[PDB]
């Protein structure tokens, strides 16, 4: 029914516009972000996190190479197996998001 | 795989051998302690809050 609500209206386009969009009511902005996440929608993310809690080991030579080095430390090549999302602007939404964060630090200038 | 089962057994064995010591929990605690709210006092307050008025208490790992 959420998919139907999304058909509403709102709209995928409306949501994209809102994200690109700046200003407006605080209650409104937050509400819009929340609605998009819920219906965009995140649900899949929750399922994925739950699956993601456990660790599953795969047996492929590429997987075999992995390993970590002490001299060195870094943040993030994963052999873990997680079901592909059944499933928007995917990589596109992602690009928009990466862009917003930068805009955000800039706004998050001082005073 | 049979090899996979063997690997799993090996892993269990390593874990079994692996527990050792050196904790340092004491060292971390000391650092936190040196470290007008309490540096940890906050932690104690958090414990008081979790909990109060609850029907039952559940083994939260962070607390224990």
């Amino acid at each position: 029914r959420v998919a139907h609500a999304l058909c509403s209206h709102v709209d995928q386009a409306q949501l994209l516009h809102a994200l690109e969009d700046a200003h407006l009511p605080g209650p409104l902005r937050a509400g819009y972000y929340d609605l998009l996440i819920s219906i965009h929608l995140e649900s899949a993310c929750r399922s994925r996190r739950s699956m993601l809690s456990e660790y599953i080991v795969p047996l492929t030579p590429e997987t075999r190479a992995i390993t970590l080095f002490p001299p060195g430390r870094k943040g993030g090549v994963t052999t873990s197996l997680r079901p592909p999302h059944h499933f928007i602007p995917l990589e596109a939404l992602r690009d928009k998001a990466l862009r917003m964060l930068g805009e955000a630090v800039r706004d998050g200038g001082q005073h | 795989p049979t090899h996979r089962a063997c690997n799993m057994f090996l892993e269990s064995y390593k874990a079994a051998w692996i527990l050792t010591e050196d904790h340092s929990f004491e060292d971390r605690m000391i650092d936190d302690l040196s470290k007008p709210d309490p540096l940890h006092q906050l932690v104690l307050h958090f414990s008081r809050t979790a909990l109060t008025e609850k029907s039952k208490l559940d083994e939260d790992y962070l607390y224990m």
Binding site: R1, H4, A5, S8, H9, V10, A13, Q14, H17 | -
Partner: protein, 140 residues
């Protein structure tokens, strides 16, 4: 009679207060509640009825499981009849989720009924700029 109107007004508040911290108080609310939706949709005392309904709604999981389509429709109707008080929305939120987990069926019915009309709510579109000029200074 005037005294009566005042008394009628207070009693609702007392009931709400009585039902405020008791999970069980939430149960008496359910049977009371079928009766309640009926009473609730009534003129001259809206705030009290609304508050009682809200308490019942946030009161217990059982109340949520219980539900009447006749009741849902009646509530929606009351909301439509009376302008939104930031209250109708609250009531809808209350109907949703236990929670716990909201009841898919109830949620769907309520959602369709509210959404189907498209007369809520407000609605939004994107619109390009409606735009114009004429030539000449004057003509006519």
């Amino acid at each position: 009679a005037e005294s009566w109107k005042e008394i009628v007004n207070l009693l609702y508040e007392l009931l709400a207060s009585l039902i405020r911290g008791n999970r069980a108080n939430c149960a008496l609310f359910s049977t009371n509640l079928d009766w309640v939706v009926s009473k609730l949709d009534r003129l001259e005392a809206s705030s009290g009825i609304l508050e009682v309904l809200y308490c019942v709604l946030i009161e217990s999981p059982e109340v949520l499981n219980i539900i009447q389509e006749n009741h849902i429709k009646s509530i929606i109707s009351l909301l439509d009849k009376h302008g939104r008080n930031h209250k109708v929305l609250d009531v809808l939120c209350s109907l949703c989720v236990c929670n716990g987990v909201a009841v898919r069926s109830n949620q769907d019915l309520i959602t369709e009924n509210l959404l189907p009309g498209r007369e809520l709510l407000l609605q939004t579109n994107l619109i390009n700029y409606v735009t114009s000029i004429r030539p000449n200074i004057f003509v006519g």
